[PDB]
Design a protein around this ligand. Structure first.
Ligand SMILES: OC[C@H]1O[C@H](O[C@H]2[C@H](O)[C@@H](O)[C@@H](O[C@H]3[C@H](O)[C@@H](O)[C@@H](O)O[C@@H]3CO)O[C@@H]2CO)[C@H](O)[C@@H](O)[C@@H]1O
Ligand SMILES: OC[C@H]1O[C@H](O[C@H]2[C@H](O)[C@@H](O)[C@@H](O[C@H]3[C@H](O)[C@@H](O)[C@@H](O)O[C@@H]3CO)O[C@@H]2CO)[C@H](O)[C@@H](O)[C@@H]1O
Ligand SMILES: [Mg+2]
Ligand SMILES: [Mg+2]
Ligand SMILES: [Mg+2]
Ligand SMILES: [Mg+2]
Length: 930
């Protein structure tokens, strides 16, 4: 056959380098199929390979490395189904005798040439597809990690391209005590090593010898176990652990039960979530013991303000705590001597942070002040023209203990910095002690926020690249042309469409479910996962805990060209929940990406769109009433098929109500919809109201706007979700994206002195464009103090208590919602901002689900006027006893129910009314025919 042929010492030589290997747009997708544009209509197409070096031209423009001949072919059905985004690529066939194993041990390069054997293009090869086709089924059948057995221990790691893998065993002091070559299984490409039970507690890493296509070199490095279940401090070494060991469990752990049922849809619909962060809970609470502040174990401090506050929220109807990342994140240093927090001396900050020591704040190094004391004194002269609080805090953020933690280092070990001792197994028992305290002592279920859509890093060099060091280019999603790891998620996008990463996800969830007794999972950026993968994971976890609940962010991920995505639209009818942005934006106003004056112009139902305009808005009545349509639809569970009367009087199904061009209603059951008006992401509800409220809306009115906004969630049929501290009017001083804004901007004050509003301009890098609008709105009214915080907590607990009190609020099943739930004050003659929902328990609905009532009315008067309703004239309607008992502290203070059944609501009020049930089920509130 032909010889494919082509600072330098000749032009001739530099000229040859220009025709070399470029990009990575060839895809080896199965054993015998290669997809590559560069080979179309070319008489010579070959896959060259080199075990130990780069496929390169020799001295006189010759490609001498071993090659395999490729013949043109057409894509198979199987290939097009697996990789639809590649189905248009020119296909090429490999001989069916090719030793795939041999080629995958090193570099492979696709090379094309003309009839005379002259080179046109040469590119690197993406091999994830052939890896799955060759090894995945065999590898899926095995179990991974350091697995203690009755016989001893079996280590296993999947590394189908590695040339060598050794198991390195370390002493407690991190000295090498053994290095064992592992045994490669040819069918699966897994490597294993079996030893005795004496390895319990040992530290270990895998020493890899593996080609990495990013560097094009056979790399040698030690990597922690992607299936690690225990770690040394800062995740440097994995550790052999038996999670079933009683020494790693609090007393009574094996009998720990879920306090709230999750079996039926009606059970699930009661879910009322408090989204919390380990430091946000306790970092500021002086009544938590100092050594437990910012720790899992703070939840055991029963006498603390924070724990007593959570206990009261639970008693009032908050049912679930959702924890921001408590798997092992990368972005906090777990070595305490490398960290400085704001409660500590400025001198400590300077010793750990060279950016501070070289900054304008260096003069504070030998002061006697703490960092917090310095930040406090910086407040008085802080402004848009001198944003000095955030200037210092941005430096503090580099070396503090604070991060949301959407930065996965190891998926199946607890985070170490939240433990009192991050070295070894201690964090496991502390984490479980926290879970037990939440369930047993606080009476709430636990949801974990999980982040399988990306890794913290990829490539052969980064400290936190684990998966992409062990099986390069497999676990990350790559650009089809360049082979670069995509970053659409924020970071290093993962590839849950690949079989062994799907397996890693499911195996990880199994540990959190069985070993840590987690009750549900919130999937970060779930739209980057295939629908089929999320559903497969759910099927596997339901075998372990039949009542587990999955939900996540089902936003469009722009991955639909590669697979059917796990989105709001596509998950309809599956029982997987998604956050709904429909009611969220209708009630808050605007959207997450608004900036500048739009933050004020875009009022929501909760901040007086239409009815109480500010000086900048141009919102029309029609627009306001459209937001109310989205809000009503969301209060009915955001169902695709729910029938309502829209702002123009037209009969519309939920899918026909527009949300920014998309069908508004998307769900089959309300348990597929998670409603919210505040979350860790974007501005807090209070900060949104502060951006949007008319100047004449006083402080007490703004507190009621907060409660009215939350009422649309708490009294709706969707699952209810809220940010920790909404009940305390929580502010982040206008910070939109506070993931690294530290204790200062994320403070929640459980001593009830203030809501953390007006503590300095937020981070300039992301909110600087908002400084002008912030300065204009910030000082309109006073900052909330103890009086307003206590009043808001009472409003909040009134709402959750109402939701908890009757199964009519939480019907669960979509057909049941359609049979029972209706709205009044609809159409072109509605009173703007008055939301009136009815829930039938009468004879036409079916059985009485609530023996105390024949029906419920929810009236939310999001308006500065009193409103009168005649819709229930002649009925026996009564204001709920829960609200009557709150007197002038109720959201229903001043509501009048006249003798004739007419109801008058004051401005910015919420009333829950009921038809008392007598001897037999009554007529109720039948849904109107449409
Ligand atoms: O340096 C890593 C990464 O840091 C920053 O990204 C962070 C986002 O700013 C932060 O909001 C958070 O984003 C997650 C959302 O909170 C979560 O609810 C969901 O939507 O997923 C988001 C991604 O996980 O965390 C990310 C990562 O820490 C920064 O913006 C990036 O540019 C930077 O690369
Ligand atoms: O991923 C990095 C990104 O994280 C955070 O952005 C998140 C938004 O905060 C969050 O609201 C969500 O945005 C979605 C909208 O809510 C939804 O209505 C629709 O428009 O889709 C959006 C996603 O395309 O998710 C994003 C992405 O995580 C963080 O705030 C950003 O600063 C950061 O860059
Ligand atoms: Mg960590
Ligand atoms: Mg930080
Ligand atoms: Mg793409
Ligand atoms: Mg009844």
């Amino acid at each position: 056959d032909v010889v494919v042929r082509l600072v330098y010492d000749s032009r001739a030589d530099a000229f040859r380098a220009a025709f070399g290997v470029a990009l990575a747009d060839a895809h080896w997708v199965d054993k015998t199929t290669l997809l590559w544009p560069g080979g179309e209509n070319k008489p010579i197409v070959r896959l060259y390979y080199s075990h130990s070096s780069k496929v390169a031209a020799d001295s006189n423009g010759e490609f001498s490395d071993k090659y395999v001949k490729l013949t043109p072919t057409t894509v198979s059905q199987q290939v097009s189904m697996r990789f639809p985004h590649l189905a248009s690529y020119p296909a090429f066939k490999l001989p069916d005798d090719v030793n795939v194993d041999e080629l995958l041990q090193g570099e492979t390069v696709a090379i094309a040439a003309e009839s005379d054997g002259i080179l046109s293009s040469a590119t690197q090869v993406q091999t994830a597809g052939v890896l799955d086709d060759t090894y995945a089924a065999a590898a899926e059948a095995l179990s991974y990690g350091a697995q203690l057995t009755d016989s001893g221990v079996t280590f296993r790691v999947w590394a189908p391209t590695a040339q060598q893998v050794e198991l390195v065993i370390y002493s407690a002091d991190k000295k090498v005590i053994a290095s064992h070559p592992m045994t490669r299984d040819s069918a699966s490409g897994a490597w294993s090593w079996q030893g005795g039970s004496d390895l319990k507690g040992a530290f270990y890493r895998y020493a890899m010898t593996v080609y990495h296509p990013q560097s094009r070199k056979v790399e040698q490095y030690e990597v922690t176990d992607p299936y690690a279940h225990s770690l040394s401090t800062n995740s440097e070494y994995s550790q052999v652990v038996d999670l079933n060991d009683s020494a790693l469990k609090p007393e009574g752990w094996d009998g720990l039960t879920m306090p709230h049922a999750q079996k039926t849809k009606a059970d699930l619909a009661k879910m009322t979530i408090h989204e919390s962060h380990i430091r946000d809970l306790s970092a500021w609470d002086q009544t938590v013991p100092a050594e437990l502040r910012g720790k899992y174990l703070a939840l055991t401090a029963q006498e603390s303000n924070m724990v007593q506050h959570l206990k009261q929220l639970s008693a009032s109807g908050v049912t679930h705590i959702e924890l921001l990342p408590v798997f092992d994140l990368a972005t906090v240093n777990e070595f305490s001597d490398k960290v400085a927090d704001i409660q500590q001396p400025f001198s400590r900050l300077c010793e750990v942070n060279s950016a501070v020591k070289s900054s304008e704040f260096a003069g504070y190094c030998d002061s006697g002040s703490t960092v917090e004391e310095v930040l406090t004194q910086l407040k008085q002269n802080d402004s848009k023209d001198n944003p000095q609080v955030q200037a210092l805090n941005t430096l503090v953020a580099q070396t503090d203990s604070y991060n949301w933690g959407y930065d996965p280092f190891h998926y199946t070990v607890p985070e170490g910095s939240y433990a009192t001792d991050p070295e070894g197994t201690a964090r496991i028992k502390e984490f479980r002690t926290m879970i037990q305290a939440i369930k047993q002592d606080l009476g709430m279920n636990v949801i974990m926020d999980v982040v399988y859509n990306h890794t913290n890093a990829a490539g052969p060099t980064d400290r936190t690249s684990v998966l992409d060091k062990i099986v390069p280019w497999y676990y990350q999603r790559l650009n089809e042309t360049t082979g670069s790891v995509e970053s659409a998620t924020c970071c290093s996008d993962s590839a849950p469409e690949h079989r062994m990463f799907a397996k890693l996800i499911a195996d990880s969830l199994a540990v959190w479910t069985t070993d840590y007794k987690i009750d549900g999972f919130r999937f970060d950026l779930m739209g980057y996962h295939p629908k089929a993968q999320i559903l497969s994971a759910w099927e596997r976890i339901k075998a372990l805990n039949p009542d587990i609940y999955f939900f996540g962010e089902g936003w469009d991920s722009n991955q639909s060209d590669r697979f059917e995505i796990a989105s709001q639209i596509n998950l309809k009818g599956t029982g997987i929940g998604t956050f709904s942005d429909r009611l969220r934006d209708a009630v808050r106003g605007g959207g997450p990406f608004d900036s500048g004056d739009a933050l004020r112009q875009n009022q929501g139902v909760g901040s007086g769109a239409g009815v109480l305009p500010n000086e900048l808005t141009t919102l029309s009545d029609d627009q306001a009433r459209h937001l109310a349509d989205l809000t009503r639809l969301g209060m009915a569970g955001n169902l695709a098929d729910f029938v309502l009367i829209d702002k123009d009087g037209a009969v519309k199904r939920g899918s026909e109500i527009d949300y920014n061009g998309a069908p508004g209603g998307y769900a089959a059951d309300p348990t597929e919809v998670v409603n919210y008006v505040s979350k860790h992401d974007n501005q807090t509800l209070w900060d949104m109201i502060s951006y949007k409220a008319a100047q004449e809306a006083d402080l007490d009115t703004r507190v009621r706007m907060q409660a009215v906004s939350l009422a649309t969630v708490m009294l709706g049929q969707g699952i209810a979700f809220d940010q920790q501290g909404s009940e305390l009017l929580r502010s982040k001083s206008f910070t939109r994206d506070s993931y690294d804004s530290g204790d200062w901007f994320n403070r929640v004050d459980y001593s009830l002195q203030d809501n953390n509003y007006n503590v300095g301009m937020p981070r300039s890098s992301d909110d600087g464009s908002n400084y002008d609008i912030i300065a204009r709105v910030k000082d309109a009214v006073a900052t909330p103090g103890e009086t307003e915080l206590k009043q808001m907590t009472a409003f909040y607990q009134e709402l959750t208590a109402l939701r908890k009190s009757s199964p009519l609020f939480t019907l669960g099943d979509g057909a049941t919602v359609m049979k029972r739930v209706d709205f009044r004050n609809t159409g072109a003659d509605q009173q703007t901002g008055l939301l009136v929902m009815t829930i039938d328990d009468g004879m036409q609905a079916g059985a009485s689900l609530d023996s105390r009532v024949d029906g419920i009315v929810v009236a939310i008067n999001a308006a500065p006027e009193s409103r009168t309703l005649q819709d229930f004239a002649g009925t026996s309607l009564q204001l709920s006893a829960i609200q009557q008992a709150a007197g002038d502290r109720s959201l229903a203070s001043g509501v009048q129910v006249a003798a004739d059944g007419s109801v008058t609501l004051p401005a910015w009020s919420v009333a829950v009314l009921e038809l008392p049930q007598g001897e037999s089920q009554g007529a109720g509130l039948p849904v109107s025919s449409k």
